[PDB]
Ligand binder design. Structure first.
Ligand SMILES: Nc1ncnc2c1ncn2[C@@H]1O[C@H](COP(=O)(O)OP(=O)(O)OP(=O)(O)O)[C@@H](O)[C@H]1O
Ligand SMILES: [Mg+2]
Ligand SMILES: [Mg+2]
Length: 456
């Protein structure tokens, strides 16, 4: 399938035995440790400090798989960065967790960006997106021990971010956290593209969960752009139903719909599913991508698997995988969900360290289904996507990085010796500046000045 998307994960950061240490500082020390604080990677990825958290923004990708690949790559990058921070003269040993909460009452988001037609009514987006985002935590939920933002509430939930959203629509602020974020920063031609900023998702360790999160959403976004959805999935008290779903790991609870019909999160997801199948069949027909049908079947299988038993998905889904780890401890040690150990286990699951990370052990123990190979994940660290402008950005920093004064999604600003003014080549088109467009040019160009000349 093809959708221009990206995943910006704000990594949970902690400094052991460092009450004095500042998040902004620790978050910066790690981002600066990888430099050899906004840093653009050869990956086309972005490393920077955001909200006092180290953040990794994948390069722009055209599919949920590559998004998975370059997000995962970000984990390896975060781990490496944190290790280097300890190697630096500054002694800080920084723990990084890919998670949405520190269980202290603080919540940092894993953002998913999608490129949509600007012509797509935002009202239709909100209408059909809200119900989807509320109920997608079934597979997407990283899982969280403790209920409510404070986490003092005894229990296990699907979503780590669910308790942190008061409002359904609006701009994301420090005080309020909307389900549907109103911020439009396309970083692409504004008339042609709208960048949908999805803040409601939990950062997933599981490659499948991320795949489904991005894939299913991408599907739903397609139907919204084609105005395919006839019905209204809108839910009364979506923000409440959001938490409700998260708060029920059994997924028994049904949402109340403005049409009056009652459906569980999974049933509602199935509604989107068959609608998604019905949409792709109508449009794609036989030409449908393998990945589109893969996301389709994985979405259907998951929802069916979920309905029958959640735990059979323990290899695929974070919240189920974690729940597996958690229920084990509980049965073995007879611990209530109020047990602090369960929270440490919840947190440790997201630990970026290969040895310490519970998800990472599961992967090493073969307890998780991977959608991508570690060999590719490694390459995806220094190597950008070929199908996106990230290629031009990434390759430039690698070869021309020395001559580059600044880079972003919007452009790459070179400094050419002999030119008093900085030369800016904007990457406005996410789909341009790919391996095909700039690939040869970047191979031939001996210098940035030579490259800038070719582009001009
Ligand atoms: N045109 C686009 N369409 C879809 N996704 C995009 C686009 N441009 C960038 N992205 C994605 O957005 C992420 C970069 O987001 P960034 O960390 O800069 O946050 P932001 O969008 O500036 O907002 P904030 O700084 O408030 O989080 C990348 O992971 C990338 O994949
Ligand atoms: Mg960001
Ligand atoms: Mg963001």
């Amino acid at each position: 399938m093809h959708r221009v998307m990206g995943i910006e994960t704000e990594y949970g950061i902690s400094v052991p035995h460092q009450p004095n240490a500042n998040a902004m500082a620790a978050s910066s020390q790690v981002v600066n440790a990888y430099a050899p604080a906004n840093v653009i990677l050869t990956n086309g990825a972005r490393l920077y400090v955001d909200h006092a958290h180290p953040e990794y923004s994948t390069p722009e990708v055209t599919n949920p798989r590559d998004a998975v690949l370059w997000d995962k790559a970000g984990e390896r990058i975060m781990a490496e960065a944190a290790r280097r921070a300890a190697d630096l003269p500054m002694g800080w040993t920084i723990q990084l967790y890919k998670n949405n909460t520190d269980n202290k009452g603080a919540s940092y988001g894993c953002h998913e960006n999608y490129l949509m037609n600007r012509s797509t009514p935002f009202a239709d987006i909100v209408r059909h997106l809200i119900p989807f985002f509320v109920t997608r935590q079934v597979f997407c939920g990283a899982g969280r021990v403790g209920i409510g933002a404070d986490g003092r509430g005894e229990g296990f939930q699907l979503s780590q971010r669910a308790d942190f959203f008061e409002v359904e629509v609006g701009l994301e602020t420090t005080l309020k956290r909307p389900i549907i974020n109103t911020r439009d920063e396309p970083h692409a031609d504004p008339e042609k593209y709208r960048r949908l900023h999805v803040i409601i998702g939990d950062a997933n360790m599981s490659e499948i969960a991320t795949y489904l999160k991005l894939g299913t959403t991408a599907l739903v976004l397609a139907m919204i752009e084609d105005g395919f959805l006839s019905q209204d999935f809108s839910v009364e008290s979506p923000v409440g139903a959001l938490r409700a779903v998260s708060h029920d790991p059994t997924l028994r609870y049904q949402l109340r719909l403005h049409d009056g019909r009652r459906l569980t999160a999974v049933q509602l997801q199935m509604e989107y599913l068959e609608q998604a199948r019905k949409y792709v069949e109508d449009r794609f027909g036989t030409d449908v991508d393998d990945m589109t049908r893969d996301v389709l079947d994985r979405w259907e299988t998951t929802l069916v698997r979920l309905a029958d038993d959640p735990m059979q998905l323990s290899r695929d889904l974070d919240w189920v995988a974690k729940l597996s780890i958690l229920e084990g401890y509980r049965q073995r040690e007879n611990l209530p969900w109020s047990a602090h150990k369960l929270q440490l286990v919840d947190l440790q699951y997201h630990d970026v360290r290969p040895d310490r990370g519970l998800y990472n052990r599961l992967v090493a123990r073969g307890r998780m289904n991977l959608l991508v190979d570690e060999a590719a994940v490694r390459t995806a660290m220094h190597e950008p996507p070929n199908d996106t402008r990230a290629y031009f950005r990434g390759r430039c920093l690698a070869k021309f990085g020395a001559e580059i004064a600044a880079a972003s999604w919007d452009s790459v600003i070179f400094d050419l010796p002999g030119r008093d003014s900085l030369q800016r080549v904007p990457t406005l088109e996410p789909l341009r500046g790919t391996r095909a467009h700039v690939g040869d040019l970047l191979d031939r160009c001996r210098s940035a000045t030579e490259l800038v000349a070719a582009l001009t």
